[PDB]
Amino acid sequence: VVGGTEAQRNSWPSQISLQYRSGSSWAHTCGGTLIRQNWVMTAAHCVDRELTFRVVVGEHNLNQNDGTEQYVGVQKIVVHPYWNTDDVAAGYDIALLRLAQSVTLNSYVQLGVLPRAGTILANNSPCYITGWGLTRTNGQLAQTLQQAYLPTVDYAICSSSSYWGSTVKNSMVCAGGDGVRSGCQGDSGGPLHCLVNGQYAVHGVTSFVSRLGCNVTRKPTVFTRVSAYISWINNVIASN
C-alpha cells in the first residue's frame, strides 16, 4: 500500500497474510480475506503454482510476535475455472482456499462481509485498501499492516481511454487513481473494504496495476468485483 498508514489492530480482522513455505520458513506473497472459519478468498494469480501455502489470521507484523496470530494451512485451492494466467485483463482473478483447520474468531479474527450479488457502488464511494505490500513503487514490503483511503472509480470513468480503456471489464472494481495512494506488489489478493450504510464489506480482490508503477495517476488499482462471483463462491463452499 502506497500512501497509507499503519492500521490499528482491530480495524480489519478479516485481512490475512498468504505465505508459501520457503525452506526453513515462510514468505508473505499475497493478501486474502477470511470469509468462513475455514475459507479464505484471494486472487487466482497468487495460487496459480503448486506450492505449499498457509494463511496467517490476526496478523499485524510479519516478523514479530503480535500474540494474536493463527497459522493455518491451506488444504485445497479452488481457482475460478475461466481464470487465464496469461490474460489478467480478461478477469476471473479469484480463488478460494479451504483451510486445513478452522480458525477461532475473536476481536482480531472475524469473517469479512461480502456484498449482495450484483451490487455496484456509486462513483467515488469511500473505501480502504489494506495489506503488507510495497509502500512505494519498487520499494519494500510493509512490516506492519497498512491501510489507504481509495475511493472507487466507476466503470464509465475507469474504462474511458484516459484510464484503463478496454483493459477494465464490468466484472471489476477500480479504485484510487490520484497518483498518491494505491495498492502495490504484495497487496494483491487482499480486500477493498467499502463503507456502505455504516458497515464495511469486501467489494474487491486486488488484482492488477500499471506496468509503469503503482501510484500512477489515472491508473487506479483494479480489483475483481466480489459481487459478481457471489453464486460461484457459495457453490464452491457448498460443494466442498
Binding site: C30, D48, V88, G186, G189, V209, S210, T221
Partner: peptide, 8 residues
C-alpha cells in the same frame, strides 16, 4: 504476476 500485483 511478479512477484504479486498482476500487471496491466
Amino acid at each position: 504476476v511478479x512477484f504479486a500485483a498482476a500487471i496491466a
